Amino acid sequence: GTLIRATTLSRLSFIDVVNDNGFYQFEKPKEGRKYVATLDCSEGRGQDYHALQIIDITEFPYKQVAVYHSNTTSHFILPDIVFKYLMMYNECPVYIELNSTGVSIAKSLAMDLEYDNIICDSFIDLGMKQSKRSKAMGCSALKDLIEKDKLIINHKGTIQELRTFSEKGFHDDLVMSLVIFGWLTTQEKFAEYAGKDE
């Protein structure tokens, strides 16, 4: 009872890139392409990882071009690491799940690093406000993208997590960061970020 149907899961495949201290790069940034990054931060104590997914949304199919995945990042430096990769991907907009750590990272990006491509649900929510409906609808959107071959997955750990991710409520941070992306794609504001500049 996986979210992604078995035949699709069986055809997923990864490019086995070297881990650069948590950063996995499948495509370099390219001129004229438009990206988005989604961030699922770990919170509190336990066995979870921070997961930043960077997706090329210039045109279909969308592509997973890089991932940052770590549970050994110093809290003091996580905003600077995210900022580095957003700047790399053509000053990438970012959509952060606003758990306690995500609220702090979003504020650091806005106030300390002065990054001005933060996707915000509202003036007081500097990212994706937590809700149950955003998870469910983001999962449905992600299922359709992967099953219709409209989102290409390259990363080994992401595929491993997709193969065990249940259709209802093992690590899942790489999938949950893709669920944030799926939810974004259902919103009116996604048209501000997707597509070539006109």
User: Residues at the annotated binding site?
Assistant: 40, 48-49, 97, 173
In this complex, which beta carbon is closest to Mg ion, that of residue 158 or of residue 194? 158
Binding-site residues for Mg(2+): 40, 48-49, 97, 173
Q: Is 101 in the site for Mg ion (CB under 5 A)?
A: no
Helix (H, G, I), strand (E, B) or coil at 4: coil
Among 26, 37, 39, 42, the residue binding Mg ion under the rule CB under 5 A is 42
Distances (CA, A) of 132 to 34, 128, 183: 29, 12, 11
Q: Is 173 in the site for Mg ion (CB under 5 A)?
A: yes
Q: In sequence order, what E strands does 120-198 have?
A: 151-152
Q: Is 48 in the site for Mg ion (CB under 5 A)?
A: yes
Q: How far apart are CA 182 and CA 184, in angstroms?
A: 5
Residue 86: burial class (beta carbons within 10 Å; 0-12, 13-18, 19+): buried
Distances (CA, A) of 67 to 39, 44, 47, 173, 175: 10, 22, 19, 11, 12
Q: Is 40 in the site for Mg ion (CB under 5 A)?
A: yes
Binding letters toward Mg ion, positions 115-154, x by CB under 5 A: ----------------------------------------
Specify the stretch interacting with Mg ion by CB under 5 A; choose among 8-16, 71-79, 107-115, 169-177. 169-177
Applying CB under 5 A, the residues found at the interface with Mg ion are 40, 42, 48, 173
